Subunit: 495 residues, 3 copies
């Protein structure tokens, strides 16, 4: 008659965590921290739409391939989307010096303003209107890059050009020009007459002189000739000067770098959908609530940290339980307002009252460690897009190795921190449960008997008033010693 | 009279582990996980032999240095071995553009088929048979690279060459050619007559034009002239076109990239031995049983993970013990079929019976954590060979820094995971031993006395039948209460 | 009457650590491991002073800009200090090939010896004394780079130069030369007459031929022309040969690489102060006592490891406490010569005696784990200075990403090792305190009563002689059983 037990929570939970020791450990309370869902669309970053290059590449856009649309509104972009193998690029064949370096400069760039440095009508001494090619159809007629000029000899004359543009603005100016390589020596004279020509550029920082490389090459896009382009960034209060005796592909428009910041070149074959997100990946956007995802490693914006894992679940409550009176036997399904409590078993009581003095402190120590574990990975490696050419393979590998190299690490760190601190959590409950036992045992000494299954039976008589006192740490041995003494010896000489 | 003790294993083990807290901790059972033995030979990877370049370098091989042997059988290789400072390389001096990029392309390459694009007899209008040099002895006569042609003027004439090869196969074609730089202007006319010449190459992707750079240079291998080479990969359904007015070193044979995959260029001064392995390092092969080694950081194949450590030992059993009856005193040398057990001490028994209910569960939880710790490092950084030229030092450092940088990490990770989970293991036994005590104590309450040294003495009388019941969790207090009650008070008023 | 308690230390300590679970945990004993103070000066590394380039850059120094001071004493340096935007660099405009690669070669370099290869008087056939410019004032007169020669035509003649230097020494020789690009074709004839010229260099390893690139460029430092420079390292027993028909900027002095080793190029706008240190950062030197700092990530010398953290404190003693008799109640302010002890409470004693058997072992296990945690980070990533040009941005990023990438890791590792092993420490004391209790409890069985608050009261009578015996593990139950038996039943039938 008249007992009491120490026991813990257990409920209809079935979500399971893992540890270093065990796997698939059913628990009462746990939080998933891994996002692994994405919407599959291409969306804007917090109101700021991407530059969707469509079937075009970066070169075609900036050179003005007649198939690539230009951006007359000077839009701001959050990023730039370019298909994997873009169909509209160098419509007239050739090369594009330091293209990769220049794609990299887009990444810290958010807005352009196209300005006209050298208008087409200002080529008085040459034939500007004839440089076009079958390689470059607009409406199926032969045309050409809309931002450069294919200068051609006038009346069979090519006056040596010398022309300059002073950069009179505050922004950095992006300037592109090129040179033409003809098939045979006859085609050179056919177009520029001067048998030996050159194309010279001069700024405060970059000085070069390009000579035409005449060779026989396979017909690419119908053309056996090649045209290679150059670029440079003209500083404020500087001035560029071209001069050539022939083969000069001239600029008409320059690009004004008006907004530098956080951007990138995403390669995705998606097109835009009326849609916004805080995190974007080439395959879809992301619900940036959970601190970890495994969707794509190139994610941009306010994103959770990418790890290579199938699952990542924390452990917050105890592991689940029927398990009768006593913690030695398992969980009590009956408790609801706490993680640890007791069972009354009074002359006039039933049981089930939680110890809020230690549940609240435990709800405070785990949940305060849960967000704190998240904050331990803020400085986690985030990968960045980059591009390299067929003669840069070594540093392409190195980049991959480095980035793959950090991902493999932080995946391991994150897994380990979950696995370890999960076992540290469960071992807390076991220690907390077994500790609540002592708070009682230490305080009810001879007045009761340790049944062993984690319960106590009183040689004294408790009552509801007494049984709200050692829960609170106020029960007095001296107040109940004499009756406990007497009933104790009653069995010492009982039956 | 009639006692019982809780105790653990201890045996003739002397292997010792370390932890964060202690070092050289003698234990009963532990597994070494570090390979640090290698056979010292150069061997094949799972049946697939390496390409052993011998005293030759990659250039000498592919150019066909008369001293380098060619590989007529089109062999497949698992890797390529090249001595550190190979003696047979550019026998005729000069340069070799993008050599490092090309060594890097070997690494994803497993088999070549040499094919003849431009036969030697098809140089009708020039003198192909005279281009040789003292720089290039075969059988001590003056010869030349066996895969290119040193074209020379015929009857003091050098018709401008224009020649093409359409790539009519599926494989990528590797093509090498070069140009000659003569000593003085007289030597140019001596060999090619045309005072100003050039060497032009055209494909869909690469277009260049090289002009001879006439200068005075020290006699290297007897030659003050230089010959520099170029290479490019000709895609299927493409076509390369050379044309030159002089100085043209021509291809005869092209290399067909027939097998791409996992390979590498190992630098080792070893030669092949009839021998096979799953893991190879430049100093010897490896017994790929243990998950970690410290042999060499450039290891290729099915290899264990390389860490920079002298030793790496897990801990699986308890730490070793004479230590008499009781776990407070130490290990029991007497137990063999378990890690935790008891000692009978019956009127008619002796002792030593293991608790298999908890040994098997412990043999299951450690060994299940042992292999699981191994699997936590599958995605561990593996270094990759790479090469750089005397003007690429910065990215050479960066590569080293990065690779050294990851090794230092994963070494630390691995050490820490051992050190930590080793202490977690030992603390398990201590917790397991002390827990077996309670399973008993909780179940034999007043029927016995806690001696303190971890043993119990019965006020009741047990017997062999009773003493196979609380081991199993079936002993009944009520069944033995009255006798225990009576003998209990016998001493309460005894002597 | 006549009691005894188990309790621990507590003192006037207020330094607080953090863990994974808790923050700001007041403890008795802890060690700071983070340096975050620096002296703000630029100092020498262990007796070896830096090369302070002052307002000059590396180019100006080695070319001998008339404003840059030369180093006639052939000094050894521990490092090189160069302001961020150095004012004295290429005083005459132009370019400097592979400058970054060459700055990188300084980093493994500690001492130069300037030697004169080609004296100025030995330019018999040309005008060496006239090459100067307004771009290069010394004492406000027009001058020029003090280590190269601006060769100019004599009597309107420019004999084709052919000149060689055999490297007759053991050191590697560093050699710099350049070429001149004039404004207009008239300026070429004005200075060198030969309309088409070239500048050719030949060694065993490097062969090139530079042609002047005539173009119109903005007046930089008053000059619209440009002069670009080249460098190469001449091996022992080798020989370099220049020859030119014009535009040749010639070497007079070469640099002898006499000491290679650990050095670097620090960018700091500090100047030297009579001052020495073992660790230097661009903002100040460092007290290299603590194993971690957060001052600057480019630190050179015998330095502690840099982490990105505000604070990093270990935990060595227990957490601080008034807390009366008993460990259940808290710390005893009274103990001084130990971490764990007791309280006598004798008929003739007071209390407070430490258990040195377990304090010394604990002072040994923590302090032996404290230095050992430090040693777990010896192979920690240290960043290295490096430089890149406006067309190398991609690998600049990669370098940053990699280095930032490792710092973020090892910061996390170090934080985690503190946080975790701090909780492992505190949990040791709790386990140690509770273990000292059992050493007593296990040994004083029925002779006393467990009061619950962590104290014992003797049914026996102890005394000072008896109360130095279970502290030492020598107290005998049988020696004191009969009196304890008798006084035990005295209360069993007492009041």
């Amino acid at each position: 008659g008249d007992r009491i037990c120490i026991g813990y929570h257990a409920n209809n939970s079935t979500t399971q965590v893992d540890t270093i020791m065990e796997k698939n450990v059913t628990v009462t309370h746990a939080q998933d921290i891994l996002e692994k869902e994405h919407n599959g669309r291409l969306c804007s970053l917090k109101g700021v739409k991407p530059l969707i290059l469509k079937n075009c590449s970066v070169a075609g856009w900036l050179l003005g391939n007649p198939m690539c649309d230009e951006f007359l509104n000077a839009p701001e972009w959050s990023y730039i989307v370019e298909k994997d193998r873009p169909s509209n690029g160098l419509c007239y064949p050739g090369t594009f010096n330091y293209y990769e370096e220049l794609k990299h400069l887009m990444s810290s760039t958010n807005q352009f303003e196209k300005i006209q440095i050298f208008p087409r009508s200002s080529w008085s001494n040459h034939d500007a209107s004839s440089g076009v090619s079958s390689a470059c159809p607009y409406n199926g007629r032969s045309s050409f890059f809309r931002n450069v000029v294919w200068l051609i000899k006038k009346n069979n004359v090519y006056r040596t050009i010398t022309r300059t543009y002073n950069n009179t603005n505050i922004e950095d100016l992006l300037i592109i020009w090129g040179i033409h390589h003809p098939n045979n020596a006859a085609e050179q004279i056919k177009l520029y007459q001067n048998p030996s020509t050159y194309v010279s550029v001069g700024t405060s920082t970059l000085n070069q002189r390009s000579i035409p490389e005449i060779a026989t090459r396979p017909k690419v896009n119908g053309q056996s000739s090649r045209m290679e382009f150059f670029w440079t960034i003209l500083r404020p209060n500087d001035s560029i000067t071209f001069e050539s005796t022939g083969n000069f592909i001239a600029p008409e428009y320059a690009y004004k770098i008006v907004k530098k910041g956080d951007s990138a070149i995403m390669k995705s074959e998606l097109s835009y959908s009326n849609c916004d997100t805080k995190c974007q990946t080439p395959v879809g956007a992301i619900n940036s609530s959970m601190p970890f995802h495994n969707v794509h490693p190139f994610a941009i914006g306010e994103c959770p940290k990418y790890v290579k894992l199938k699952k990542l679940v924390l452990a917050t409550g105890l592991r689940n339980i029927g398990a009768i009176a006593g913690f030695i036997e398992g969980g009590w399904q009956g408790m609801v307002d706490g993680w640890y409590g007791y069972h009354h078993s009074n002359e006039q009581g039933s049981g089930y009252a939680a110890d809020k003095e230690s549940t609240q402190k435990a709800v405070d120590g785990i949940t305060n460690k849960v967000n704190s574990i998240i904050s331990k990975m803020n400085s986690q490696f985030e990968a960045v897009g980059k591009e390299f050419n067929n003669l840069e393979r070594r540093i392409e590998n190195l980049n991959k190795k480095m980035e793959d190299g950090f991902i493999d690490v932080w995946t391991y760190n994150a897994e380990l921190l979950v696995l370890m601190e999960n076992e540290r959590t469960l071992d807390l409950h076991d220690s907390n449960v077994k500790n609540l036992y002592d708070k009682v045992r230490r305080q009810l000494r001879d007045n009761a008997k340790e049944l062993g299954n984690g319960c106590f039976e009183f040689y004294h008589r408790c009552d509801n008033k007494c049984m709200e006192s050692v829960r609170n740490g106020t029960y007095d041995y001296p107040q109940y010693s004499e009756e406990s003494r007497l009933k104790r010896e009653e069995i010492d000489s009982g039956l």
